Design an enzyme around this catalytic site. Structure first.
Site, PDB file in Angstrom:
ATOM      1  N   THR A  12       1.005  -1.972  -4.102  1.00  9.11           N
ATOM      2  CA  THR A  12       2.465  -1.847  -4.201  1.00  9.11           C
ATOM      3  C   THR A  12       3.230  -3.089  -3.777  1.00  9.11           C
ATOM      4  O   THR A  12       4.475  -3.097  -3.784  1.00  9.11           O
ATOM      5  CB  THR A  12       2.989  -0.633  -3.433  1.00  9.11           C
ATOM      6  OG1 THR A  12       2.863  -0.863  -2.024  1.00  9.11           O
ATOM      7  CG2 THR A  12       2.230   0.594  -3.854  1.00  9.11           C
ATOM      8  N   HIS A  39      -1.277  -0.867   7.214  1.00  9.02           N
ATOM      9  CA  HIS A  39       0.100  -1.327   7.341  1.00  9.02           C
ATOM     10  C   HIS A  39       1.021  -0.168   6.994  1.00  9.02           C
ATOM     11  O   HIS A  39       0.569   0.911   6.596  1.00  9.02           O
ATOM     12  CB  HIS A  39       0.368  -2.493   6.403  1.00  9.02           C
ATOM     13  CG  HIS A  39       0.152  -2.143   4.966  1.00  9.02           C
ATOM     14  ND1 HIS A  39      -1.084  -2.210   4.369  1.00  9.02           N
ATOM     15  CD2 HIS A  39       1.000  -1.663   4.032  1.00  9.02           C
ATOM     16  CE1 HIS A  39      -0.990  -1.793   3.120  1.00  9.02           C
ATOM     17  NE2 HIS A  39       0.261  -1.450   2.892  1.00  9.02           N
ATOM     18  N   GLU A  62       6.988   5.110   0.082  1.00 12.91           N
ATOM     19  CA  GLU A  62       6.811   4.618  -1.271  1.00 12.91           C
ATOM     20  C   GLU A  62       6.506   5.786  -2.215  1.00 12.91           C
ATOM     21  O   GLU A  62       7.201   6.005  -3.209  1.00 12.91           O
ATOM     22  CB  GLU A  62       5.710   3.582  -1.290  1.00 12.91           C
ATOM     23  CG  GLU A  62       6.077   2.313  -0.542  1.00 12.91           C
ATOM     24  CD  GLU A  62       5.235   1.140  -0.985  1.00 12.91           C
ATOM     25  OE1 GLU A  62       3.988   1.289  -1.011  1.00 12.91           O
ATOM     26  OE2 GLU A  62       5.807   0.097  -1.336  1.00 12.91           O
ATOM     27  N   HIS A  90       5.180   1.054   5.499  1.00 18.84           N
ATOM     28  CA  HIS A  90       6.424   0.836   4.768  1.00 18.84           C
ATOM     29  C   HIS A  90       7.457   1.764   5.408  1.00 18.84           C
ATOM     30  O   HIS A  90       7.158   2.916   5.695  1.00 18.84           O
ATOM     31  CB  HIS A  90       6.255   1.194   3.301  1.00 18.84           C
ATOM     32  CG  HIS A  90       5.143   0.469   2.618  1.00 18.84           C
ATOM     33  ND1 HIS A  90       5.341  -0.652   1.837  1.00 18.84           N
ATOM     34  CD2 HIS A  90       3.811   0.709   2.601  1.00 18.84           C
ATOM     35  CE1 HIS A  90       4.181  -1.064   1.364  1.00 18.84           C
ATOM     36  NE2 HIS A  90       3.236  -0.256   1.814  1.00 18.84           N
ATOM     37  N   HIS A 135       6.610  -9.594   5.272  1.00 14.90           N
ATOM     38  CA  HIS A 135       7.245  -8.457   4.628  1.00 14.90           C
ATOM     39  C   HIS A 135       6.848  -7.179   5.355  1.00 14.90           C
ATOM     40  O   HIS A 135       7.492  -6.139   5.172  1.00 14.90           O
ATOM     41  CB  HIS A 135       6.827  -8.343   3.157  1.00 14.90           C
ATOM     42  CG  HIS A 135       5.379  -8.029   2.985  1.00 14.90           C
ATOM     43  ND1 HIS A 135       4.388  -8.963   3.198  1.00 14.90           N
ATOM     44  CD2 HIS A 135       4.750  -6.880   2.635  1.00 14.90           C
ATOM     45  CE1 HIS A 135       3.207  -8.397   3.009  1.00 14.90           C
ATOM     46  NE2 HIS A 135       3.400  -7.135   2.659  1.00 14.90           N
ATOM     47  N   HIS A 158      -0.506   3.068   5.060  1.00 10.08           N
ATOM     48  CA  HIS A 158      -1.549   2.805   4.092  1.00 10.08           C
ATOM     49  C   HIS A 158      -2.747   2.217   4.791  1.00 10.08           C
ATOM     50  O   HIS A 158      -2.659   1.148   5.411  1.00 10.08           O
ATOM     51  CB  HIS A 158      -1.061   1.825   3.037  1.00 10.08           C
ATOM     52  CG  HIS A 158      -0.043   2.410   2.113  1.00 10.08           C
ATOM     53  ND1 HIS A 158       0.784   1.638   1.329  1.00 10.08           N
ATOM     54  CD2 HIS A 158       0.278   3.695   1.848  1.00 10.08           C
ATOM     55  CE1 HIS A 158       1.574   2.422   0.614  1.00 10.08           C
ATOM     56  NE2 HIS A 158       1.279   3.677   0.904  1.00 10.08           N
TER      57      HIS A 158
END
Ligand SMILES: [Cl-]
Ligand SMILES: [Zn+2]
Length: 258
Positions: free
Chosen positions: A196, A92, A104, A94, A62, A117
């Site tokens: 999250t 990592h 996010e 997003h 993901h 993050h």
């Protein structure tokens, strides 16, 4: 695992396997800058990454993680809103299907192109797996990415992505200095929240920097050439791996600044 970012296993569905998805301290959230309460008693963050020791980068399916050797006892986040010391374990990102979304956290409803993050666990719990079971188990430093000038310190991350294109692939990733990913200012907002991604555990003190880092269009576009799928499977480009903002409920976001 069943969960992902598809129409049928995406964030709207997570609550079925992870009922805490509808809990009282879920992340991310929208940060209303007018109502976030300035608290002049909040200490400066202490980010000590001089001795952080990167190991590997892995496609988890993901997203990708850059993993660190968390036995390095000076590779630590402390200060700010935190008691004690937290060890860096991984970072990592997003990101979105286009530059207009991907973060996010949001700031007055504004979505950034991506969000980084840096995940740290409370040493008073021995290791990460024990820490996630406690309300003060983790500290996650969140940093927004916007598109503009290039971030030289990100280049080694984006250039290696080709070699870990599909789920399960990994690559040596030593000698990476995460100080290269930090903006000039460490002013921040903080609130108690959650992981999250599943299991969505409410174990996180969020520290979200006010200042985004600039990355170039080419840099962020390399994120989107990653694939969700494993080798040989039909190509599914890894994009829109962000959970939307969740209800703040009875929490207060505090600001370390004006
Ligand atoms: Cl590039
Ligand atoms: Zn994350």
């Amino acid at each position: 695992h069943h969960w992902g970012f598809g129409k049928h296993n995406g964030p709207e569905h997570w609550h079925k396997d992870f009922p805490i998805a509808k809990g009282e301290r879920q992340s991310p959230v929208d940060i209303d800058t007018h109502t976030a309460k300035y608290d002049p008693s909040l200490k400066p963050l202490s980010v000590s990454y001089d001795q952080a020791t990167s190991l590997r980068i892995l496609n988890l399916g993901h997203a990708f993680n850059v993993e660190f050797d968390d036995s390095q006892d000076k590779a630590v986040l402390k200060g700010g809103p935190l008691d004690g010391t937290y060890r860096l374990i991984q970072f990592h990102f997003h990101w979105g299907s286009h530059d207009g979304q991907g973060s996010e956290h949001t700031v007055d409803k504004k979505k950034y192109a991506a969000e980084l993050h840096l995940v740290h666990w409370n040493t008073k719990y021995g290791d990460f797996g024990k820490a996630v079971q406690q309300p003060d188990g983790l500290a996650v430093l969140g940093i927004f990415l916007k598109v503009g000038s290039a971030k030289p310190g990100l280049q080694k991350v984006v250039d290696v992505l080709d070699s870990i294109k599909t789920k399960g692939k990994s690559a040596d990733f030593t000698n990476f200095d995460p100080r290269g990913l930090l903006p000039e200012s460490l002013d921040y907002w903080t609130y108690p929240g959650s992981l999250t991604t599943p299991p969505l555990l409410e174990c996180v003190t969020w520290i979200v920097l006010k200042e985004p880092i600039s990355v170039s269009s080419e840099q962020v576009s390399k994120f989107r050439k990653l694939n969700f799928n494993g080798e040989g499977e039909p190509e599914e480009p890894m994009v829109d791996n962000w959970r939307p903002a969740q209800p703040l409920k009875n929490r207060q976001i505090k600001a370390s600044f004006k």
